[PDB]
Amino acid sequence: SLQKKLKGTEDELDKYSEALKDAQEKLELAEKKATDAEADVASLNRRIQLVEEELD
Amino acid sequence: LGFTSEEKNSMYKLTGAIMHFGNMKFKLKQREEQAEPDGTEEADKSAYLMGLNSADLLKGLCHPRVKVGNEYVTKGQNVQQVIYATGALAKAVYERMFNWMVTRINATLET
Amino acid sequence: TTALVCDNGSGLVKAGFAGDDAPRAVFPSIVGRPRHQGVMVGMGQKDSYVGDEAQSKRGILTLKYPIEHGIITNWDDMEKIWHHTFYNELRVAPEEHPTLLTEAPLNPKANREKMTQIMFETFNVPAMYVAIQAVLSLYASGRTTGIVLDSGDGVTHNVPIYEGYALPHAIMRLDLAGRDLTDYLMKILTERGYSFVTTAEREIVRDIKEKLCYVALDFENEMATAASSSSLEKSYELPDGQVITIGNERFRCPETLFQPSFIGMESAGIHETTYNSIMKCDIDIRKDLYANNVLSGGTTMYPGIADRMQKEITALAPSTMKIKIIAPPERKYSVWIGGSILASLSTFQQMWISKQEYDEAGPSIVHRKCF
């Protein structure tokens, strides 16, 4: 009689696995984006200090 | 030829089962290297044709049992392994039906 | 012709033919001798029982293991074991079959040399080869890199391999295994009154261990759970009757693998020798090694040991790497499976030690590039 319990557990497990996969996908995406944006801002900031000493 | 209509019917349905083997779909598990089926409909219909249970055939494909001395232990499979096994099973059943058809032909011819 | 694959191990002999999916002869590596007098004349009883027969006659014999920690200590007993394996379980003539033997890393050299000498002089095989257990485990696992942790019954060892190259300076070997876990369980089972002292009650305790023990994912929380509840307490029925009830020592036994101080050893757990082997390897293969951490051998068969190992190694390694632990269901036979694969490889048929090579170069020919 516990087979329905087993099947329901399998279903919620599958749902949670899909959820985890989607969350990992969004995580790696946003992390690549944040790292790239930080690279750009650091580069251009150093460039700003260089053009500032240039102006000086 | 000497063989009945039911036998031609079984031949045709067996070939259709071989055809149904190809569309099976397997995925890796959650955080492991084990294969598990996601699509079950073609599995159900191929079992209903072949004369087996669908859950039982899926279990026999994902988890073979091998004999170690006097005990049986379950072997693990991934997607590539289960696909190679499916292909070999189909080739085997086809060639088997073919050889037996030739035996039936020779029995009809036999004097 | 076909080659035999005899995975001697230490506490379980596994033999078969090269090219099969599993061994066809798995029996304990014990030799028993009767300890009582024997009164019935005409019984014509033997003087020493080998293998699975000794486990039937347990109550009458003294069971001795001829292999302590990988190392063979009783050469006459081991020769009896091999004779039984060749003639009674497999039923083959060893003078027609090459034989592939296995050994653990970092054993004495006389072990391997005397093994070769026996296999050529006594059993008269045409060729032979001694292989390392971890390499064969990696063959059977389908990998070509990865750090393998082969916990048998005598020894535990890590052997990191990358692209088929083994890094010998990073090989670790620990002398804690299933036999020490059995002794620790015999010892801590006395807290509830059960006493197992005979050399044949050790087999009963080994059965209890196999059937009831498991690894806790967190040790203090399971300690508290057992102190409060009784939901983890299970029962077992001896060969005599009189069921015994096992409480929190279901998970205190295999916890010795992660806390070798329980049995008074100095060393560190398996989770920490694995990580130390990693950190002793190079810097640019550590990511692959973290991702390909392979388990094999009987002492890795506890429930929850993979999850525990992953939790520990994950807490040890840097937070930016995917740590993955490969634990097949046919772990216990991985060394034998890999040995069969290797001996069937057509490329391997030139790595055997032929009999003429031995006759001309002595038993020292074993440590050559066939090492």
Ligand SMILES: Nc1ncnc2c1ncn2[C@@H]1O[C@H](COP(=O)(O)OP(=O)(O)O)[C@@H](O)[C@H]1O
């Ligand atoms: N399911 C299990 N759980 C825990 N320990 C086990 C299990 N199965 C076997 N063992 C232990 O494994 C040991 C045998 O390991 P094995 O792979 O045979 O090594 P070897 O071949 O070198 O003896 C035995 O001492 C036994 O206690």
